[PDB]
Every structure is written in structure tokens, then in C-alpha cells.
Amino acid sequence: QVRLSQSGGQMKKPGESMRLSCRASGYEFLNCPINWIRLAPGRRPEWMGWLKPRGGAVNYARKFQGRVTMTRDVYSDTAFLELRSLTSDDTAVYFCTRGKYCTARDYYNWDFEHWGRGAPVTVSSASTKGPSVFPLAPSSGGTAALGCLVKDYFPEPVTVSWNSGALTSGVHTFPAVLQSSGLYSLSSVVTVPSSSLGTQTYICNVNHKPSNTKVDKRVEPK
């Protein structure tokens, strides 16, 4: 069966270069072109170019010429790509694709029935940083709201639970947002009976694996 196997995602700094691989299997590699496509969230998908494993001939979109290099290793059926002078504009998920129709006689490149799992690439100047966690303290009908503010971490993602997962109902963990500083921020709130605040203790379980920071923040009425 046709399978495109991609190397994982990565975090670059602006100015650097990135390299990705894509090993094809289940078919005759020389039969038809390999493509590289980038998809940035809420942005029109961009075809970067194609490579014909036979001879290694290439075709680059005007936009990328001089920055991108596509090659292959015919023996291992692996396609390679490099992108130089990265800018934030380059942040995206990078895919390799192959057309549906691909025989010895001929092909049709542009019906992408086969895709790699994708390689998510973020380019920014932020360095991996663990979140400082601040309380969102409740205040005195029968329900009170409270949470933790998880601010200034990079990169995504962070996970948040309550009282070690013992508390699930009422929990609202919002999508992170990217601040103008390059660091992420998100909030996690929960509603509870405002009569529990007196006795019931509420804890914030924050886990940010990328920085190995694990915080148990106790939230209490102020």
C-alpha cells in the first residue's frame, strides 16, 4: 500500500534553515513526481514544488526559488527538502504528496490521494519557556467562578486539570492565544457552588512538557 513516511516536526529560529525527509513505499518510486505543500492555519495552502525521482528534475513555485532545494535518494526511496532564510511567514505544517494516478505509462500529479502525516514547523525568536501560573480568585448567586491564568509559555502545548482530575464538571480550558511577544497564554476556569469555597480546596494542575514544568497551583478566595 502507498505510504508516505515523514520525519517529525521542529522549532526553528528566524534566519536558520530546515530539512525534512519523506520516504515513499508500496509503489515504484520513479513512476511519478513527489510534491511538497505547506498549510498555515487560516491560510491558503501553498504548493512549494515537485520533484521527479527519475533524474531528480524539479519545479519550484516562483515564490521559493533560491530558498528551496528538493533532492532524493533513489535507493532508499526518500525525498528531501530544504528551506533557507526562514521567517515567521514560514511557520506551517509541511506535507509531501503524490497524485492518485501513477503508472509506468503516465500519471496525473495534482490529485493528492497520498499525504505524509505532516511536519509542524514553527519559526520564531522565542526560546522554550515554562509558564508562570496565576490564580483567578473567586468572590462572593449559588455558583462561583475561578481558575488559573497560564501565562508566558513556549512552545505549545500545555495541559490543565483540576484536583488531579477528580474535578471535571464545569471545567472550561480555553484555547491558547499567541501574544505579541511570541509567548502563549491561556486560562482555565471552573464554576462551583459558592458554598464550597469555604471548605472545598481547589487546585490547578499545570503540565508543560516542553519545559518539564509541572505546577500544582492552589486557588483560594481573595
Partner: protein, 340 residues
């Protein structure tokens, strides 16, 4: 009365028992003598659709040329990545001779005599023949060498010009000689010569034809963007040697002075990437002595840059398509049909 069909064709040539050149010999074995008296019957008020991009005849020639290269261009060693095999490295005397392709009983070949037929669509002037004209299996990249010529004016061939992954074939209506020499006595330093005046003139015409098929946008040429030397360079076999010529100069935008003779720097290689499939072949060191091939450029292979949108410009680069395209550039006007 008839229908489109594939089948096993046989070859015909003018190969002579006395000639010992390798291609000639292969033919004395594979083919039969060319028909002494050809018969071309014009088919009255008839119309037929051709598609050179899907012509099974191309596949059959392919298998022959692979057969031909297996007994005429056997390398000293083959590196298939998985193994490295040694084998006899016979001296090679190779000079392609015209090969005719013919149909067996119950079938027949159809020929399109429209003087500006670009390779796809209906043909008005149709005739019936038992064999193609003699076609030479010349293996080369970027430039199509020693082929037939357009009978009217320059013709742009493509399965679909708006599809950048489809090969473009230009068919000159007036050949241009390319004189290639490697002096005797670095025994790799070779060069090629072309008349700048004749060449550049032919460029004006092709680009003017190209512009015609792209809603009058500025046509500009650029060197290849990457890939193996077989692809980024004009590559061909001369007197058993493998030439590799830099074509930057032929596609000079400004020249479209520029009247004199332009000379390409070529290099001869002993280690090459085999076209028949995958792996590197190793041929012996260059023999001593002056080596000189004079060929006729009759067609060009182009790839259009993709992802334009804005502009205003269309950018073409020499090469590359596929080796089967060389045969297509000659088989374009023929198709096999079956009686009943």
C-alpha cells in the same frame, strides 16, 4: 470499419550483413528488410483523433532501445546501490540507424498529414501506411537531435500547456547544426559550436510561437533549477563517449551583437546515471584522438515554471520530461488501429 488497438509490431530497416556497427547488427537480427515499395493510401473524407501522449507504439520502441543498449553499451561496472557487479567492457562502435515500425496482419497504422497538427485532436488529411518512416533511436536530453522537422512552421507540443507537470516539446521547422568536438592529446575538456545567428533567429521564432500560446505574456528562459547532470545539461552519446554540455549560452534572453559563433563547454564522464532504470554505470577511460560529432537540432524539451498567479511572465527551462518523449517527438503522427 476500424478501432483503436495495441499490438506487437515488428521492425524494418536497411541494415546490411556486411556492416558491423552494433545497431546495424541488432537490426539484422531483430528486423526485416524495409519495404521495397511503400503504399500510402489517402483516406477519402475521413477524420480521426490522435493522442501522441497516449501512444502504445512509444512503449514498444522503448523496450527495443533498452534491448539495443544492453548489447551495444554494456558498461564495465554497474552500481545498483544494492550491489556492484563487474563485467566485460567491450569497445563500443555505435551510430543509430533509421528504424521502421510496422503492423502485423489484421491491423494497420494511421498517419496524420495535417501540416500543423500539434499532437492531439482530430486530423483532416489522413492516410494509411504499413510502417512508420525510419526513426533513429537517438538518446539525448534538452535538445532533440537528428529527428524529423515540422513541415510548416514551429510547433509547440504538450498534453496540456496549462499543466506545469506536463512535458513541452518544441518542433523546429528548420534544423540547426551543433558541432561537438573533443581535441586529442585534461582529456575531458570538450566543447560544442553553434551559429549564433541561425540559433538566436530560431529562438525569436519559438518564443514568438510560445508567446502565442500564453495570451501574449513575456517569455523568458532560465537554466534548470536542479537535478542530476543528465538533466541539468545537454547529454548525449558521441562515438561511444558520453558528452555533457552546458546550455546556459543557447538560451540567452538578451540575444533575443549576438551574431557570431557560441561555443558550449562540455565534459566527458565515465560514470553516469543510467537512463534505462536506476543505478550508476561505469565506462572505460576516454580513448586518445580527436572526437567529433555534428548533429542536427530538430526539437527542444522545456519545463514551464509553476505557481505564477501575479505576472505577466512565463518562465521556461531546458529539459527535461522523459526519454520516452524522444520517441513521442517522432511517433506523434502515427497510431495503430485494428480492422473491424
Amino acid at each position: 470499419v476500424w478501432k483503436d488497438a495495441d499490438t506487437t509490431l515488428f521492425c524494418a530497416s536497411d541494415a546490411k550483413a556486411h556492416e558491423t556497427e552494433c545497431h546495424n547488427v541488432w537490426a539484422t537480427h531483430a528486423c526485416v528488410p524495409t519495404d521495397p515499395n511503400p503504399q500510402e493510401i489517402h483516406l477519402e473524407n475521413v477524420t480521426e483523433n490522435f493522442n501522441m501522449w497516449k501512444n502504445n507504439m512509444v512503449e514498444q520502441m522503448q523496450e527495443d532501445v533498452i534491448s539495443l543498449w544492453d548489447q551495444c553499451l554494456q558498461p564495465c561496472v554497474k552500481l545498483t546501490g544494492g550491489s556492484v557487479i563487474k563485467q566485460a567492457c567491450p569497445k563500443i562502435s555505435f551510430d543509430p540507424i533509421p528504424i521502421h515500425y510496422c503492423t502485423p496482419a489484421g491491423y494497420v497504422i494511421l498517419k496524420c498529414n495535417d501540416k500543423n497538427f500539434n499532437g492531439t485532436g482530430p486530423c483532416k488529411n489522413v492516410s494509411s501506411v504499413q510502417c512508420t518512416h525510419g526513426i533513429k533511436p537517438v538518446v539525448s536530453t534538452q535538445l532533440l537531435l537528428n529527428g524529423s522537422l515540422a513541415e510548416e512552421e514551429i510547433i509547440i507540443r504538450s498534453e496540456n500547456l496549462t499543466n506545469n507537470a506536463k512535458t513541452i516539446i518544441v518542433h523546429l521547422n528548420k534544423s540547426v547544426e551543433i558541432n561537438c568536438t573533443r581535441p586529442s592529446n585534461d582529456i575531458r575538456k570538450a566543447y560544442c559550436e553553434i551559429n549564433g545567428t541561425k540559433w538566436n533567429k530560431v529562438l525569436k521564432q519559438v518564443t514568438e510561437k510560445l508567446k502565442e500560446h500564453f495570451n501574449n505574456k513575456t517569455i523568458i528562459f532560465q537554466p534548470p533549477s536542479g537535478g542530476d547532470l543528465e538533466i541539468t545539461m545537454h547529454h548525449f552519446n558521441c562515438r561511444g563517449e558520453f558528452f555533457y554540455c552546458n546550455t546556459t549560452q543557447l538560451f540567452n534572453n538578451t540575444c533575443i551583437g549576438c551574431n557570431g559563433t557560441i561555443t558550449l563547454p562540455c565534459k566527458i564522464k565515465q560514470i553516469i546515471n543510467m537512463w534505462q532504470g536506476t543505478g550508476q554505470a561505469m565506462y572505460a577511460p576516454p580513448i586518445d584522438g580527436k572526437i567529433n560529432c555534428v548533429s542536427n537540432i530538430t526539437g527542444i524539451l522545456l519545463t514551464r515554471d509553476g505557481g505564477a498567479n501575479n505576472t505577466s511572465n512565463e518562465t521556461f527551462r531546458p529539459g527535461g520530461g522523459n526519454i520516452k518523449d524522444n520517441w513521442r517527438s517522432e511517433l506523434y503522427k502515427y497510431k495503430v488501429v485494428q480492422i473491424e
